[PDB]
Amino acid sequence: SAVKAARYGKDNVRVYKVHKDEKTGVQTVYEMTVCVLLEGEIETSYTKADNSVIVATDSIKNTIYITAKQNPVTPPELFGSILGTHFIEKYNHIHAAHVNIVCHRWTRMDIDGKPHPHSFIRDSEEKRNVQVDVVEGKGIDIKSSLSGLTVLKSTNSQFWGFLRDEYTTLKETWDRILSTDVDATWQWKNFSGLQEVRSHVPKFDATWATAREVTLKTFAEDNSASVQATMYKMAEQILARQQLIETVEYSLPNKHYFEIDLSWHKGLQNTGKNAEVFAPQSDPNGLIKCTVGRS
Amino acid sequence: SAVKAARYGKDNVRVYKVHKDEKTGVQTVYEMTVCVLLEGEIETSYTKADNSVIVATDSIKNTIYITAKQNPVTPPELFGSILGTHFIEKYNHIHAAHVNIVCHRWTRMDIDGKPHPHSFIRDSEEKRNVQVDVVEGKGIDIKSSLSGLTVLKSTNSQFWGFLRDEYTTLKETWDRILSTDVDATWQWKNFSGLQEVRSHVPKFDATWATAREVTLKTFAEDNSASVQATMYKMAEQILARQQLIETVEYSLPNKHYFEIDLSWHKGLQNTGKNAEVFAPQSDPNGLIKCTVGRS
Amino acid sequence: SAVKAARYGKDNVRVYKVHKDEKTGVQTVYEMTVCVLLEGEIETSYTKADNSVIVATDSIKNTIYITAKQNPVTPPELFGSILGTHFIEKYNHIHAAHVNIVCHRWTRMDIDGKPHPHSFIRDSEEKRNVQVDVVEGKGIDIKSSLSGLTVLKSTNSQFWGFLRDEYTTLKETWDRILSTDVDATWQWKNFSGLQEVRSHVPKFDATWATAREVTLKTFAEDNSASVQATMYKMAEQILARQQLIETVEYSLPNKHYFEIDLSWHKGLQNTGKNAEVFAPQSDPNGLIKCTVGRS
Amino acid sequence: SAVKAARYGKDNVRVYKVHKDEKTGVQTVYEMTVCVLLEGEIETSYTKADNSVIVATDSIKNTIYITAKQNPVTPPELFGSILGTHFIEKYNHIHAAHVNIVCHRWTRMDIDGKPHPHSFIRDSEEKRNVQVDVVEGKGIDIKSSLSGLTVLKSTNSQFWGFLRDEYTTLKETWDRILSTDVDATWQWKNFSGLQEVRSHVPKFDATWATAREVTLKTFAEDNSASVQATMYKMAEQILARQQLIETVEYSLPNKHYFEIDLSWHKGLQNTGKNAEVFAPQSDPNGLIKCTVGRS
Ligand SMILES: O=c1[nH]c(=O)c2nn[nH]c2[nH]1
Ligand SMILES: O=c1[nH]c(=O)c2nn[nH]c2[nH]1
Ligand SMILES: O=c1[nH]c(=O)c2nn[nH]c2[nH]1
Ligand SMILES: O=c1[nH]c(=O)c2nn[nH]c2[nH]1
Ligand code: NA
Ligand code: NA
Ligand code: NA
Ligand code: NA
Ligand SMILES: [Xe]
Numbered sequence A, B, C, D: 001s002a003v004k005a006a007r008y009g010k011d012n013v014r015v016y017k018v019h020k021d022e023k024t025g026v027q028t029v030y031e032m033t034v035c036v037l038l039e040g041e042i043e044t045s046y047t048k049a050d051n052s053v054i055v056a057t058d059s060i061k062n063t064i065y066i067t068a069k070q071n072p073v074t075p076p077e078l079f080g081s082i083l084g085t086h087f088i089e090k091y092n093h094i095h096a097a098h099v100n101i102v103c104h105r106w107t108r109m110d111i112d113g114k115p116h117p118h119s120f121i122r123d124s125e126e127k128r129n130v131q132v133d134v135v136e137g138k139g140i141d142i143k144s145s146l147s148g149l150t151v152l153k154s155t156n157s158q159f160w161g162f163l164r165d166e167y168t169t170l171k172e173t174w175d176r177i178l179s180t181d182v183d184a185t186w187q188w189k190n191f192s193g194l195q196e197v198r199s200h201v202p203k204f205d206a207t208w209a210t211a212r213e214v215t216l217k218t219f220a221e222d223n224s225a226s227v228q229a230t231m232y233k234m235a236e237q238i239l240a241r242q243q244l245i246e247t248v249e250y251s252l253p254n255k256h257y258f259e260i261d262l263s264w265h266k267g268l269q270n271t272g273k274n275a276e277v278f279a280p281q282s283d284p285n286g287l288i289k290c291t292v293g294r295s
């Protein structure tokens, strides 16, 4: 037998950082969960019990805190790239670092219509994420994403004209509820190294904002022919607005809300045009994915 | 042996309702999870296998949908009272109904600075809840609550002057992070029945809004001496603003964020005045409760 | 306003303890999650920012570890009583301690038909729990429980003869699946203090074992007329076997498995006597409770 | 823009099947959660709102139930292969089916030392899983796995001789707790189609059993030099016992249990040789992976 692939590191490292403006007294907080996995010439730790090649996972944890202390942690694309680069430069035998960062929302509170200097609220479990793969001699590959954005529209969704055969019971519809949890990922062109990532820093927050805005607007405004058709429209627009993105991927559950026939009870009318009360279904759910790139 | 207490019913009933304004085209959605448990002269179903006394839990589920179809589902205090009253009036041998409702957020989307007619976002997992106990001959008792409101302030929290003995290692502090998930419950004076609940309908949404606002403002503005002192200030204000509330209860976890000493690494300074990077602790957590009533 | 009730302490304190037999080399592990909440003359910490009355929650955490170091942690009824008693004896102004303990399963592995001296498996998320309330001048009240015991029987469950009215759609049945997650609690007679709890130590593990065995046997063997009837039979037997128990409470979800009519597809027969494939329902679920005591 | 990749289908489809032996009266239950995603000539549903190419996800759900009705559901490798093959044979324009199956434990109860004919217990949340990719013209690729197997050993684990530099604080150790949740995957040689999968049916359950047994025995018996070294030993043995496996992958969290220094309290000794009480850490955790194949 032989080691075909191996990676190891530290997962679920929670980090908080505060920035304090001495002049204005305004404080800004960042909270993330970080995972770092390393690859390189480490096979002997598996095959020969040779621990000399192992950078202890506890040391990786220390490194994350030290790096957060000495560098900005925003945008996460930059922080991930700094953190990944550290390991390949510091350790001769480590040749790849894989950094995943989940950013948690701490939104500044408005008290009496004014932004509070040091108080924050978690407005939703929506996350902004990055995956950064730093590979020695092959640059920095960055995938940025948003996830956990949960939306619903109560009309202006249709689904008709699908394949009908002996397995089909679903009725065609011209008016249904559409609800999903959005997972959207945009993959950046490969970067040669940290200097190049630094040169593009302003694009990271702007592109996240654009992806979010396009997702929300398209969902709200499209008279949707299917999840497939609506998600394609989203991806198309993102690619049009940021030339440094190579591909956009969406993964969307179709969270079903079923009509409830109440006609058995005193002829009560609750279907089609008369539908007011619905039963949200926890499972099963449709799952629709697509990756869109450039012609 | 004898049956000392018994209750049964249906839990986790998900319900969605849409309201459509024909004039404006604006649609408004409500989504809830409902639990109904009944008590009464049902001992024989346990002791003698006498099912004749059982209103099937499946029928309770049907009743929830039918009641939602025929009545407003907001404010939840009113809907819960209608639903509970139904069971005690309909069934001679049922003498109490216990209704719990969790309301999920579907917040209208703003697209290009304008409210969208039929598109919604789940902005946070904060819930608005009610517990309604309808007891034949004893009226309607309603406890309203908010939960899952997660907040953090990065300064203006202190904790010093506590008891110190041979079990104590905690250092006094004049500047710490304070973060909690707020669970706040206000208990209404007993209502004689549905007519009285209906007469107070406007107070329910207003009091929820007031409780939320007082919680957020007090948290943001108090230079907190402890969780205990800050939560008391919140409860005091709520009681002052709504005379129909008898008691307010808060239950607050103290979600700890620990300093990280980095001095072992090149004398790096990250504690006290120099603290910038912290380690959020998932467990254990302080838990602080109090119930405040009128003198 | 006035403080009507108040309690505070530390939740989610994870503890592991190992016992090492020097003679045999056999090691035995215990893992628990502990919560301790205190009450007493602590109102001024809420109303006057007087922290002098507060035993810091961090100190409570320390106390749990120290107490686990110096005392046996099994049976949990004894450990909880020692821990609770400590606070009321140590602190003049603390008059009640509320201790909740959840015990996690670490079951000794059998390797080649032999018990391994120091290796363990988590066989299921079933828990053994205790709630101990130590109240100065009123002794020690202990509620013991098991929870998270998930079972299913594929036949020998019926449900017919229930109330039928205009809200009822459920068909009577003489053969259905019955599945539940068992939560069972037995409440001990009040104990005067630690000496009395110590005197009954052997009864705690034996009664837990009896409760588990009676639950499993009755579920497996009863030709069940309803959840209500079967659970009553369980509680009856437990009370008969341990005179020091005052009441037994069961809380049982009815986790539904629905027939799937496949007759629309080539006349395929999958209902009633021909039912083979079913759809487990995640929600809603029946919830049935009862508390049984002595005549 | 262009569609680079696309797949869609139904997730979280819960299925239960019962088998009834008419002769012995013994019943056996199977419960699974199934996901099916399809690929093929479906781009136009995304780009042109052409639903004619879409096999509705609701129809996929129906197909899963119908297939379970007409075929054995065990071993899951066979069921997944039948289900996947169905879609590529039935639909001209569908060229790949991806089937994931999670099997839930329903273990027959022993009542009074005898196996009960129709009563079952969920002994642990350990799962047996399969991933089956059926690709037209490229056969059937099957990855089998077990997951959620949680184990702990209280001694006979060491970790010393790792890299030490200015980022390192971890002390070397010759005696520590080792605990993990095992995720192990074995990848089968490619199969040409259903006939070949059928020909190997007995190997599927046997190999699962072997993987489980080797994992447990090696964990219990290895005087572990690291997670890396122990997991390699496991994978090596599995590959040696089943020639039809091409690779074995393990992914193991290192769930840390920390010593608690209690010396500040009356010189209490709780570290090194005297360590009895430990603090399980919920996060962060080491994560160690490796894929082992044949020389
Ligand atoms: O078994 C281990 N492997 C590792 O890579 C490691 N790093 N810290 N502790 C550890 N333990
Ligand atoms: O056992 C049952 N008890 C009940 O109260 C009930 N209601 N519907 N189905 C049921 N099954
Ligand atoms: O606000 C606090 N209240 C408390 O009771 C406490 N105990 N430790 N830290 C604390 N902080
Ligand atoms: O938008 C949809 N896309 C689909 O593929 C589908 N299948 N059933 N319902 C559906 N809705
Ligand atoms: Na390198
Ligand atoms: Na009545
Ligand atoms: Na006392
Ligand atoms: Na095909
Ligand atoms: Xe969508």
Ligand SMILES: [Xe]
Residues within 6 Å of the ligand: B180, B219, B227, B230, B231, B252
């Ligand atoms: Xe607070």
Ligand SMILES: [Xe]
Residues within 6 Å of the ligand: C180, C219, C227, C230, C231, C252
């Ligand atoms: Xe039961």
Ligand SMILES: [Xe]
Residues within 6 Å of the ligand: D180, D219, D227, D230, D231, D252
């Ligand atoms: Xe391991």
